[PDB]
Nucleic acid binder design. Sequence first.
DNA 1: GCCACGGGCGACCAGCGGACGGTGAGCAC
DNA 2: GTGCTCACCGTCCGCTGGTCGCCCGTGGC
Lengths: 158, 158
Amino acid sequence: PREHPFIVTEPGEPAKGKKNGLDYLFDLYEQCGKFLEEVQHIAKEKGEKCPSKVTNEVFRHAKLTGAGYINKPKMRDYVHCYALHCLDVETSNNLRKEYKERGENVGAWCQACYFPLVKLARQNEWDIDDLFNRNDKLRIWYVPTKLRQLCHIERMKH
Amino acid sequence: PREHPFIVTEPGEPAKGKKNGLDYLFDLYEQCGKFLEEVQHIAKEKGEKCPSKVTNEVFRHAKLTGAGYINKPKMRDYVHCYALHCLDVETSNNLRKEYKERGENVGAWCQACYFPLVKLARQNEWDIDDLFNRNDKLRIWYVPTKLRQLCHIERMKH
DNA sequence: GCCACGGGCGACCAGCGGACGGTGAGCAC
DNA sequence: GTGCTCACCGTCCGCTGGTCGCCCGTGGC
């Protein structure tokens, strides 16, 4: 059965009602990294191809270990949000406070996350891929297509 | 349109007849690296996903860019041979001279290359992936499945 | 109860990495 | 000329990474 929908929460704020907050959301990425660690270890033992990123097998191993609440499309929906939380925790917290105060839904918050990321990519000579690779938490996540496209167009405009 | 078959040659020895030598074979790996670099530079300009290894797109680009003699299954047959040449030239050269002196065909030489590579993987805590990733030339090539499987069975035996 | 809203995640797709053996080139005699 | 050896690479396959929107949970009234 389908998980509760997310809601915009401030750091350390519990979601009220039949909803999950944004700290629960970011923790799902941290749990995935632990399931990637396990898969890598098993593959090293088996003498099979070892993944460097979160693959379909990592999701499949998470589902069979009871963590059925973890799935590929949902993790993909918010990778950029998690990237901002990792790369600039202070902007990520302020953005969450701003969106909560406005009584904004998750979708508007999720779309707003791309914009401070464009700034971070600008400061790193427009290399969004390198920004993910230098970070231990982000290293395992694929750069979302929409973020790379938005970064490229913004570079042309500015 | 089929290319000449390869023959076992010693370093710097030209192949005789309607045949190609082993230095020509190793040069094809070098050409692929240049084609990947092109594909990489183009992607960076377009703001598209950048490959870190030789993908189907690299091979496809080589064909349309005047190097039609390059194709994926051929390059895949000898990745392990190219790996011995990069990781240990001296052993690669002696193996080539030995197989040439015995009047051996390419198939027998090709299968012999796996064994010195197994010793090299053993000397690196059985981590064949690390061996490839630490070398500039090899980094762009996928570890062949047959090699990783052979290292695994050898680890269980020795 | 009821409806409108909005997002979770099932399921689909293009193309990937990977494999194999039938043609047909090649050389010895 | 003839035969017979053997490997190049056409062509296939289990999946991958990436995507979209249907279904239905959810909260307000």
